[PDB]
Structure 1
């Protein structure tokens, strides 16, 4: 098979995104016949250079996940990606750890396939334009750049939250993400710091192409704003040296291969 074209010729650009209707995953699976068990897809007519594992930090967000799958699967296929969806479900009911789950996703997805690109996406963010590539570039890529909840612009120029893509080497270079940001906030800023401290800069699509919708939701319990976050982001340069992939442990309790995604339920513990 020849290589897929550098830019997909299948894209349609701007899309209409709605979250006001029920979603039936069995139906979504039917509308996406080429997506195989575990939520895996690769074009059958050409070889994609983008081997992407899409990692979603998760707990009690099934409804949001249905909308995510409904919208992203058609988009990822049009982008001609060789991809897999991984929902990292945090076991238990103790304080949430978004970034540690993302590290779990990276390490566990690599056991499935030789992925060389990682998209880290919150479960409630949907792209409004398929020209917004869900794959990696020569520099870390910030994808959800113009979110409606931020008035369709970046909240601040160093904002790197929501959805991003790091190549395998970029991720390894920064020793992955921090494992000690328990509760809401700051971990995305820490990741931004890591990239900068390793000589990288943030690549971004323009604001129109990067328009993204956030599914309005209320505060989840067990993920209260971390009071130590401002302090932690000020010491990233030093802490990234020993806190991340090289200090990660966890226990996978279960791996479920659904038609549209693989769900890894994992025990990531509590603060130490």
Structure 2
């Protein structure tokens, strides 16, 4: 019964998952130690199973600016999880250059476009750097519909702010992201960019996929520095096709590949 054969696809659900995890942010993290503890993660924070092929080719995009301690906790907790989930993944920290108002959604668009230059990713997880999953059955990859991953956040009492809430951590396949023309580029701290994204999905006929709440619990990291739904539905319809990936403009000032992640420093301009 011999002959040349391809590696099998990885199983529908990984047999390596452990379920609940204790998430704490009160101890120091040393990334050199984390790298040594995750020897299979390659330069730039890249990993893929050795014994099976994953259909999940995921770029994990993290909007960022001056929050190194949070990022260290993020890397410490997620790398082991992402490997147990048997994903073919890469970590991208999109660092906003300058001191102008932070623009989360625009940095996510940057991450989508830059990660694609590195590899043919077909799934994108957009994650704030201060959100950590409490259960590894919460899959960091894409589904038949846009996926909302951080569904029961401790900062919100482990309950969804509202059924249309799409903030924190989410995942869109390449097809899903492209069809909504990505995310809006003009929410300069205005708040509600996630609601605009939700409106884009609905308008294109998509719905929200969510893991069961029991495994969707996430912890939020506090920093020395419940949400309500913003409207702008009519604005989204009017603006989505002219404001997003197609109109995205930015300058890449630095690209650093570290053992556990790639950091792309970009100048995304100032509010126009």
Q: When the two structures are aligned, how many residues end up with a matched partner?
A: 266
Aligned-CA RMSD value: 1.9
How far 1:120 moved relative to its partner?
0.0
Deviations 1:149-198 (A, max 9, x none): 00001011110000000000000000000000001520011001100000
Summarize the Cα distance change of 1:64–1:175 in structure 2 as closer, same or farther, 3 Å threshold.
same
Structure 2 contact 162–229 (Cα < 8 Å) conserved: no
Q: Which runs of 5+ in 2 are unaligned?
A: 1-6
1:210 aligns with 2:248: no
CA distance in 2, matches of 1:80, 1:271: 40
Structure 1 contact 85–261 (Cα < 8 Å) conserved: yes
Structure 2 contact 165–229 (Cα < 8 Å) conserved: no
CA distance in 2, matches of 1:34, 1:148: 31
Equivalent residue for 1:141? 147
How far 1:227 moved relative to its partner?
15
How far 1:218 moved relative to its partner?
3.7
User: What secondary structure sits across from 2:190 in the alignment?
Assistant: coil
User: What are the residue-to-residue correspondences of 1:61-76 with 2, within 5 Å?
Assistant: 61-76=67-82
Summarize the Cα distance change of 1:206–1:228 in structure 2 as closer, same or farther, 3 Å threshold.
closer
CA distance in 2, matches of 1:35, 1:18: 23
Summarize the Cα distance change of 1:154–1:138 in structure 2 as closer, same or farther, 3 Å threshold.
same
With structure 1 as the length reference, what TM-score do the two structures score?
A: 0.95
Structure 1 contact 41–77 (Cα < 8 Å) conserved: yes
User: What secondary structure sits across from 2:155 in the alignment?
Assistant: helix
Summarize the Cα distance change of 1:157–1:261 in structure 2 as closer, same or farther, 3 Å threshold.
same
Over 3 Å off, 4+ runs: 226-234
